[PDB]
Amino acid sequence: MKIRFGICGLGFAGSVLMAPAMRHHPDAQIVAACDPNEDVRERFGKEYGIPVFATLAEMMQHVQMDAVYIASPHQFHCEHVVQASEQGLHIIVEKPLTLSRDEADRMIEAVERAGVHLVVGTSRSHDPVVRTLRAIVQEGSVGRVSMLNCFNYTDFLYRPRRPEELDTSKGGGIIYNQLPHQIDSIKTITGQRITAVRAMTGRLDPKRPTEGNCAAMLTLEDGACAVMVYSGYDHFDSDEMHFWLAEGGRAKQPNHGGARKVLRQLEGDEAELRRSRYGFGGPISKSDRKQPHFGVMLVTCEHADLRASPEGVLVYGDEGVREVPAITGRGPFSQGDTIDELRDAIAGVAPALRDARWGKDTLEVCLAVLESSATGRQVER
Amino acid sequence: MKIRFGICGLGFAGSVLMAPAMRHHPDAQIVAACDPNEDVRERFGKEYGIPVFATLAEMMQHVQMDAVYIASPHQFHCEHVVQASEQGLHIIVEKPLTLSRDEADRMIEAVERAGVHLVVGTSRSHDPVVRTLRAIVQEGSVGRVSMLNCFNYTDFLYRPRRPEELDTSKGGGIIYNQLPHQIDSIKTITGQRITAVRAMTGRLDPKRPTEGNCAAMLTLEDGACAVMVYSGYDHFDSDEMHFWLAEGGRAKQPNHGGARKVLRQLEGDEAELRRSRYGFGGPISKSDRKQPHFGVMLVTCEHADLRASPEGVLVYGDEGVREVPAITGRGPFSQGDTIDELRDAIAGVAPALRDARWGKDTLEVCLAVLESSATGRQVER
DSSP states (O other): OOEEEEEEOOSIIIIIIIHHHHHHOTTEEEEEEEOSOHHHHHHHHHHHTOOEESSHHHHHHHSOOSEEEEOSOGGGHHHHHHHHHHTTOEEEEOSOOOSOHHHHHHHHHHHHHHTOOEEEOOOGGGSHHHHHHHHHHHHOTTOOEEEEEEEEEOOGGGSOOOGGGGOGGGTOSHHHHTHHHHHHHHHHHHOOOEEEEEEEEEOOOTTSOSOOEEEEEEEETTSOEEEEEEEOSSSSOGGGGTTTBOTTSSBOOOOSSHHHHHHHHOOSOHHHHHHHHSSTTSTTOOOOOOOOOOSEEEEEETTEEEEEOSSEEEEEETTEEEEEEOOOOSSSTHHHHHHHHHHHHHTTSSOOSSOHHHHHHHHHHHHHHHHHHHHSSOEEO | OOEEEEEEOOSIIIIIIIHHHHHHOTTEEEEEEEOSOHHHHHHHHHHHTOOEESSHHHHHHHSOOSEEEEOSOGGGHHHHHHHHHHTTOEEEEOSOOOSOHHHHHHHHHHHHHHTOOEEEOOOGGGSHHHHHHHHHHHHOTTOOEEEEEEEEEOOGGGSOOOGGGGOGGGTOSHHHHTHHHHHHHHHHHHOOOEEEEEEEEEOOOTTSOSOOEEEEEEEETTSOEEEEEEEOSSSSOGGGGTTTBOTTSSBOOOOSSHHHHHHHHOOSOHHHHHHHHSSTTSTTOOOOOOOOOOSEEEEEETTEEEEEOSSEEEEEETTEEEEEEOOOOSSSTHHHHHHHHHHHHHTTSSOOSSOHHHHHHHHHHHHHHHHHHHHSSOEEO
16 A cells, blocks of 8 residues: 655655656655655755655654665675564565675664565566566467577766776676666566676776677576676777667667766766765756666567567567557656555555565676676576 | 689579670689580670580680689589699589588599699688778788677578488588588688587478578687677678668668569479579679678677778777778679689699688588587587
8 A cells, every 4th residue: 555665865766867756756755754854855855845864763753654775885785684684574675676786685684683575676687578587488379488688888987076986896896787677677577587797897987997899698497598788998889789769768868988088077076066966956856757677679580580679669570560558667668667566565455576585686697797707608597 | 813613513602603704804714614404504605705614524625714604503512622632723613512521632632632722612701891801900000800790681581492402411401502601701810710509590481491580699610709699591681780782782672571482473393483593694794893791790899890881991980980991802792702712722822721621611610500409518629
């Protein structure tokens, strides 16, 4: 029925992506928020008409709530998840889940012993086009998946960043912040375990020395494979091969120089541009759109190739093309579907797919990309 | 200067692709032809005004010539190559080179002991867009190649075929008839040896049980990798992601049912449709075009992504996009460039790149795709 949510961590994912989508979602009410930053917290409390807090602990002591949406920096996810679990609160947590397998185990153990439901965390696998691709595959007519092909060329590395985000050791770069979207989509579309990983990564800019590109072949469990390719250097832009839609569904304008131009001319400190542009009540808090997507994703089955469209899925069949509209979610497009997955779990309609074990599993696939790329070898798991 | 050519084997590659391109090529004169089929041979002799013959041996005994273009069925390539070599004639040979490593060794040994030049055989790597991509890479400004991404979705399996062409054991299917175009392009663009192969193949149609799709990751020798994906089931059509140009440069019209429709309604025997449509003086002998291409090919370097265009190469740089026209060849687009590579070799301007050893090497990479796909393992070579 109606889930009373607290938001924990009010950076970009929290305040600007998820929060408005929650207001607008009919099965969800924002009831409270916390963040370490007194400034942002207070502004957010005024605009949404809710009490706010400096720590999760305090929010849990002072507001009747059913779930927490945890959008704190990843280094805080483990303890935030344990803490919510110990209160019997259900959870949505942003990616990265964690960087650490041990953490991931502590999270699983806490959630399971508490009996709560957890979902992670607005992936692009919540995109209805990806859910639609799954429905088409299970439905059966299209036949078995033989292979998938996903690629996304992007300007990610040249968006405004804090300097810890350009250190893979601290969680930066595309392995932890982008590849999970493809990996989760591949798992979602196929319903198969990833059993082997061959990947190569590059860090083609030494001024920003984290991973910006990757080429990978993922072996799935029935012998099907998925190729996954990602590059973030703001060179090719693959929305050209996806109807010139942006990732978030709104039409895109070519801007190839784009993010790199903005940074070169920038006078001052980039970290500031980051928090002033993507913070709460900054520019991008200003948001007739089509389906969201992540690069292009070509699923080749026995009786068809499948591809995400602005409205649903393009099915290239034996007979020629036809279109399938995207499965209606109850609220907004990705963000809303994340909420639906939890509601469904709490309601006993459907247990969560993207639980803590699925998260750990995606973390392991990321680690296997790092290993395969260091050693040159396909990594079995 | 002017190369006097004999054409040996007058099926589609010989009579309809290469022959007109040779007339039109200024450094080349067709001087004679052979083919086992009295009918086709004679028709061809009338139209090109040349003497014709039932066997290579006879042609070599009766016409002063400098080179042979060998477009016989692949099972005949070995002996055709040995025979020409033993006469001191230079050679262009169509792919497949051979299916057999031993054959490939006999071919190398004959060519080398005779001192003749050999090129194989009109690959899509002779496409000037591919040569242009190479020039850009060697030129250096764009920086090192980190990874390549090539894909082509096609209707190959449902074009009209003789029944031996739907038996991998006899040389059919995409491993020997399509993948070499990508493999050769990858080698040409990068100038690197392929040192490992992870691939999966499918035969998604049991009525036509040869390989129709493949997903592969090719490891190159400096650590760069190339992803290669191919599907031929007439479902998705990737010319959509290449400006709706066909492979051969002429604008394309969507026809997704296309080749499969033609076959389903076909009354009679498919082998007949094959030789009556693609034979000499059939329909497709009827041939203002742009650059040829093979699916799309995205080369991601340190300072740019590169992509083939209808006019040359699209360079997505730090600064934004710019276009480089395709290196002018001396004659027509792919076919002509194949001739230039031999002329250059005979003239002492540049030895051939695509010699018999390069061919064997491509054959080994194809074999490694077959092995990797049977075993699930990356194959080192």
